[PDB]
Write an enzyme that holds these catalytic residues in place. Structure first.
Site, PDB file in Angstrom:
ATOM      1  N   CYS A 101     -13.636  25.077   2.399  1.00 47.42           N
ATOM      2  CA  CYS A 101     -12.263  25.951   1.165  1.00 47.42           C
ATOM      3  C   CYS A 101     -11.392  25.231   0.431  1.00 47.42           C
ATOM      4  O   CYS A 101     -11.445  23.744   1.031  1.00 47.42           O
ATOM      5  CB  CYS A 101     -10.913  26.594   2.420  1.00 47.42           C
ATOM      6  SG  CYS A 101     -10.994  28.145   1.720  1.00 47.42           S
ATOM      7  N   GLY A 102     -10.903  25.383  -0.131  1.00 43.35           N
ATOM      8  CA  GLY A 102     -10.188  24.925  -0.819  1.00 43.35           C
ATOM      9  C   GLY A 102      -8.136  24.479  -0.675  1.00 43.35           C
ATOM     10  O   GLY A 102      -7.716  23.267  -0.271  1.00 43.35           O
ATOM     11  N   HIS A 103      -7.740  26.170  -0.506  1.00 43.12           N
ATOM     12  CA  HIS A 103      -6.183  25.518  -0.113  1.00 43.12           C
ATOM     13  C   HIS A 103      -6.108  24.973   1.203  1.00 43.12           C
ATOM     14  O   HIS A 103      -5.102  24.620   1.940  1.00 43.12           O
ATOM     15  CB  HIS A 103      -5.868  26.982   0.431  1.00 43.12           C
ATOM     16  CG  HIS A 103      -6.897  27.784   0.372  1.00 43.12           C
ATOM     17  ND1 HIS A 103      -6.691  29.477   0.148  1.00 43.12           N
ATOM     18  CD2 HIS A 103      -7.512  27.940   1.716  1.00 43.12           C
ATOM     19  CE1 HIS A 103      -8.093  29.971   0.588  1.00 43.12           C
ATOM     20  NE2 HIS A 103      -8.080  29.619   1.579  1.00 43.12           N
ATOM     21  N   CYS A 104      -7.277  25.146   1.959  1.00 44.42           N
ATOM     22  CA  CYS A 104      -7.627  24.396   3.174  1.00 44.42           C
ATOM     23  C   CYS A 104      -7.292  22.310   3.184  1.00 44.42           C
ATOM     24  O   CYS A 104      -6.165  22.132   3.852  1.00 44.42           O
ATOM     25  CB  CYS A 104      -8.994  25.014   4.140  1.00 44.42           C
ATOM     26  SG  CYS A 104      -8.926  26.320   4.957  1.00 44.42           S
TER      27      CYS A 104
END
Length: 130
Positions: A47-50
């Site tokens: 994921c990104g935000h992660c």
């Protein structure tokens, strides 16, 4: 063979940092077996935000290193741990204290700073000094 060993697996974090690599093999001997407070964050290395919560989460682990055991479970990998609790959308932080079997939905700030204040506030509630 004669002696067994382990190898480095996938994970945005690392044992080197202050964050404790929580796994579905010790999660119990690490958190469940920790009368103190534990902060497990379900992130995803895909994921990104992660991936952007690595530095923020780690920071809290550095300060709460001795205060609140801040671990980290790869929801993607440990899909068993995440789901076993109810993790469907990451990042997903969980607080362990009162009921090691049922953590609390962390709503506080997801910043190395906020986390520090959150872990503490919760710690107090518990008798476990330190």
């Amino acid at each position: 063979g004669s002696s067994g060993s382990s190898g480095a697996v996938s994970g945005l974090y690392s044992s080197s940092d202050d964050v404790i690599e929580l796994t579905p093999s010790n999660f119990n001997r690490e958190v469940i077996q920790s009368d103190g407070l534990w902060l497990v964050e379900f992130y995803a290395p895909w994921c990104g935000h992660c991936q952007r919560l690595t530095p923020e989460w780690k920071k809290a682990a550095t300060a709460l290193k001795d205060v609140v055991k801040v671990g980290a479970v790869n929801a993607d990998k440990h899909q068993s741990l995440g789901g076993q609790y109810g993790v469907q959308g990451f990042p997903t932080i969980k607080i362990f204290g009162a009921n090691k079997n049922k953590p609390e939905d962390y709503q506080g700030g997801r910043t190395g700073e906020a986390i520090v204040d959150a872990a503490l506030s919760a710690l107090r509630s518990g008798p476990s000094s330190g």
